[PDB]
């Protein structure tokens, strides 16, 4: 009973295939959970190498053979865009949920009954977060523990203390007036020719191309920055004429005639320089994005003017807010309205290249995080960590409530769900038990990666009880129980909230798959 | 080469039964998912019976007929596609009479046709009228489809859209109550806004954009017209008769090139082009205009007098031309608003099927008890009617009745309960207690009355479902020789 | 790492081989648990068919292909020798104990930790059994509930009332004044030519060989029983002589003189017959085990004696203790002191053979249960059910305590183990949980064989909770909970007691198996 070029698993083998894929994907990502976890390599085939523990990069950039596992890979892309963390632990709970469901499905239990238990435990699990969430006011010490909790899971425990104070202050630099935090206010710049621990913050923007001339000021303590988008190089005839030449010499005359289109405007830069506070103890800067001839760079440098060239559109918008000068699309209509103001503008010198820095701005409402590293892959590694550390502090401030870590919520919610009977049917009690034992994979895996026994660590933290609200978690260094609040180990509320809603939805839908049909594969 | 004899009918049964076994579990609120492996590794876990068979490529001709009939069922009716294939497959799965007993197909077809006339007679007895004048009563019926959808946020608006849009198209004066959503209730997506801004327009809409400002922004009485040197002169004259009437907008069927748009822009009117013939007929009925052969034969009567107004208001980075009126010119238009195309697509298909539900209920205000109650109720009548059925046709006549039990069978299987235990107790309830109730709970899994649970389905959906399943089973049984030939 | 002509399984896969064998043997015997369970056939190969549900017969008589599974079969032999019941439930708990242990062993847990939990769960489960046992007095109303509970599991629910009253009355006849009991006092006979429901009791005893003469009395309402072991057929010359003859007739004439030693002893028998109440309305019976001459039988037959010859050692044994007649090894010392007495003594004629019955005795301290059936295997099936029914009533009488059935004890003990924190080791509770889930296989299998859902039945009986002693079981006809003590379902205290001692020891020892080596195989 079948047609040619068609195949379908009518029995429960479709679940055994999907359940086997989740177990395989569980065993892969469980080794990179936490700081003690191992790293995964990402070979692009062409020879590039990239190391990272972030589950989203191991699911978005990497390729997976199993078709069913590619569905869960797309889920991590959704989990990353909403919260920014919890993609690895999301896959572990799905595998352990499906593992416990297979134990009961083999006993003749329908899949739909198990999904009803997850929906009941999930609603109870969400209420437990509201009871244990600590609405501590955001301060420096609290965010240090949060950023440390996020950055330690992506570095070698050496860049954590270095990157922690930088990531914390980056948000605080843009966090004020109770405004929604925007990550577009912080730009991430990379630099070679230095080690990894030299990462530090820059109060202002950083540009790739800088002043290239001997007669330039190495540092400008103050200047009226002029924003412009007009090229001061050889351009086409802008008047009702054209280029007509008879020889190489007559062609050179057209260059002299065409260069007059810029020579009248290059002196215009000298005019507004002398005009707006051209006396002593003053300065002037040009940030014209388009190209500039070496003549104009040579001319203006004699007047003591730092002129830049070949910048990006995004940098020009940030530069205007830092300085205040509006972009002039034509030098003919020059005025002081196109000027701004800034503090120290120096040039950072590397072994080969050099970069422009506009530090000490007045009101930029934006900063830059200067990353430095010796290798190319190490720059992409640290960049992925800072982006995860920034979203961690963003969620902590956007959502002022935080929760403990170290699997303390999972150990607590597991005991809470066991002490909770259904209200729709009795057989949902089995699905609640599967949800309880599934959350314990996180404190189980953290004991494995730290090199401790899986069963001894969980039994200690689960046996620890008292006549008061008490938290308890896994100590990755000692393996003994640990109160996360007494050490500074905190997670976000939206991460754990979206985790329960994400795992329940996907573990549900995977269990509702009754048959797998090939659509002409 | 050629296949004949009992091999043909035995093969068509295995084909139609195989297609039905795929979508057995996609019935009810507990519709189990299906994983379709694409050749490139892509996977979709959809649970819609239409989209599943739409993408599955089959080779057997009988299976294609079973699929194409459900497709035709999907257009005429927005529901019941999965039940047609399960019943048509279950009606054919009883091969005990075809091969072991050597009953001719003409004997069974006499039994299937006799059961169909009696199955229809049994539904109308268990029917129940409807107070369609009550908006809340009909709202309780359309909520069955709105559940588990994005339009559930403003479901009251979702029902008022489809309910009034169908009633506006509902032409009850002619008796037959002809309704055509695709013809008189054109639906178009509007970027920007939200689901709450979705409303009905009492007329025809034109999605063309304004290219130049020389156009009518607001008119009280829309005069809607309906119809290099040599090109200039031939265009200079055809445009002259149009502007002589002093129009407000010119909607020509064929294209209006740049030079033709130049003279029209001198008259300061909206340039509309690339419209179909039936659209022009709808435009004429919107305002009472006249379609003419050529611009040369235009007369003063070619006007859209009586219409509300013309408007080219820009809404969400797009100009929209309206020729609407404050009356009911035999049509309407649904302006679906949404902040993104992802939300606009869901509301389009969601409200479309919602209009089909009100279309079937308003064509005949008679419902039936769902949740397997209608199937088990009909099966009880045939089992009792077969006792007086003198002849050999009694055996396949009763088998059709037991085949209808598949609908509560699959609903109980998806819930995870015991199929035999509940189906056994279910058949006993229809014997003693009233047959109009005592169905199946698709969410709980236990038995429940349909008077306490509003799972009441329309009558026309079940009639065309059983009629199509029986006619499809009668079709494939009449196939006894599959042969090639070009 | 092995020698030639041998094999060794070094890694933990050797343990999985033993777990797979027990899981397979579990799935074989689970279908014959309880009354609604199916039956298994035993094809001896020669052509003998045999149907039975007794797990001891399905393991002892049935040879098992797998080497590991044959070990568990030897334990079922040992289990049947002590209590005579629970062999099937023993294997199902062993299969589930090793099943649950594999779930934790796959997570890296050592077997020795799990076995220490079983020893702790056993003591807790053994203490809880002392509380659930009912020490009521054993009356006929109670033993009928025990016999019905034991006999239903071996018959077609038709011989229940037939064999129940016989199995109960057979025990009550052999115990009074708190005397020690012995089932050897009850003889089990089998006869054909009658339907299976023709089983009944025999207060006396059945003998194989009957009287052989036409003038015998078919029934003797009263007689003195004379036990003898002397061959009354032709014997050799008893004096120091030989065969001094001259022809065949002279040799035959000496045989007459050789018969003088026997023929005169027949007169001694007739003498004591006429002396010890040889009057009217009286009789006399001889039960001489050895043969009797045809001519000598003519003498005793005419005197109204019902003689017997060529008896078995077992018949003479019970005939002595029942009737009291002392065995006379020589008729020289014939005296009336060695004579017994009995009531009705008659020979019931069957269609093919005949058997002598000695019913209506005062207190013979021995009875007989006459089984009747049409086939050979049916008689063997009923013989096994009676021996299992008698031993069940024996245990309830000797061990005055009884426990509820239908898995009510297993469900209660499992709830007690889960409500028991660790006391010997932290990780030992994983074995306690495995021991708890292992006990629930008994009600699970009863729901399967009865045709009900495995999960719905167990969840309903588990939900039954109240502020009082409440023990519910599986209703095989309804599926709902059922107080086994109310409806009349009672198991023995030694059966459940030996299960915990037998299940733990074997499940422990099989877990401690690290390697499987060939000893020259």
From Swiss-Prot, chains A, C:
UniProt-annotated location(s) = Cytoplasm
Q: Which residues carry this modification: Phosphoserine?
A: 200
A GO cellular-component term linked to this record: chaperonin-containing T-complex
Disulfide cross-links: none
Annotated Mg(2+) binding lies at 85
**Keyword flag Iron-sulfur:** no
Q: Which residues bind ATP?
A: 34, 86-88, 406-407, 491, 496
Q: Which GO terms describe its biological process?
A: chaperone mediated protein folding independent of cofactor; chaperone-mediated protein folding; positive regulation of establishment of protein localization to telomere; positive regulation of protein localization to Cajal body; positive regulation of telomerase RNA localization to Cajal body; positive regulation of telomere maintenance via telomerase; protein folding; protein stabilization
CDD domains, per the entry: TCP1_zeta
What are the UniProt keywords, alphabetically? Acetylation, ATP-binding, Chaperone, Cytoplasm, Hydrolase, Isopeptide bond, Nucleotide-binding, Phosphoprotein, Ubl conjugation
**Covalent crosslink: Glycyl lysine isopeptide (Lys-Gly) (interchain with G-Cter in SUMO2):** 246
Return any one Pfam family short name. Answer: Cpn60_TCP1
Q: Where does ADP bind?
A: 34, 86-89, 153-154, 406, 491
Q: Which residues carry this modification: N6-acetyllysine?
A: 194, 282, 360, 372, 383
Q: Which GO terms describe its molecular function?
A: ATP binding; ATP hydrolysis activity; ATP-dependent protein folding chaperone; protein folding chaperone; RNA binding; unfolded protein binding; WD40-repeat domain binding
**Enzyme Commission (EC) number:** 3.6.1.-
Catalytic activity, reaction form? ATP + H2O = ADP + phosphate + H(+)
- NCBIfam families noted in UniProt: chap_CCT_zeta, thermosome_beta
- Assembly and interactions? Component of the chaperonin-containing T-complex (TRiC), a hexadecamer composed of two identical back-to-back stacked rings enclosing a protein folding chamber. Each ring is made up of eight different subunits: TCP1/CCT1, CCT2, CCT3, CCT4, CCT5, CCT6A/CCT6, CCT7, CCT8. Interacts with PACRG.
Its function, per the record, reads: Component of the chaperonin-containing T-complex (TRiC), a molecular chaperone complex that assists the folding of actin, tubulin and other proteins upon ATP hydrolysis. The TRiC complex mediates the folding of WRAP53/TCAB1, thereby regulating telomere maintenance.
Q: Which disease is it linked to?
A: De novo genetic variants in nearly every subunit of the TRiC complex, including CCT6A, have been found in individuals with a broad spectrum of brain malformations, and clinical phenotypes ranging from mild to severe epilepsy, developmental delay, intellectual disability, ataxia, and other features of cerebral malfunction.
Please report which protein family the annotation says this sequence is part of: Belongs to the TCP-1 chaperonin family.
Please report the name of this protein according to its UniProt entry: T-complex protein 1 subunit zeta
**Taxonomic lineage of the native organism:** Eukaryota, Metazoa, Chordata, Craniata, Vertebrata
Whichever gene encodes this chain, its name is CCT6A
From Swiss-Prot, chain B:
* Cystine residue pairs: 326-332
PROSITE patterns xref list: TCP1_1 (PS00750), TCP1_2 (PS00751), TCP1_3 (PS00995)
Q: Which residues does the record list as Phosphothreonine (modified residue)?
A: 390, 419
* Record has ATP-binding as a keyword: yes
| Coarse class of the protein's main subcellular location | cytoplasm
For the modification Phosphoserine, which residues carry it? 156
Q: What is this protein called?
A: T-complex protein 1 subunit gamma
Q: Which organism is it from?
A: Homo sapiens (Human)
Q: What is the lineage of its organism?
A: Eukaryota, Metazoa, Chordata, Craniata, Vertebrata
Gene giving rise to this polypeptide: CCT3
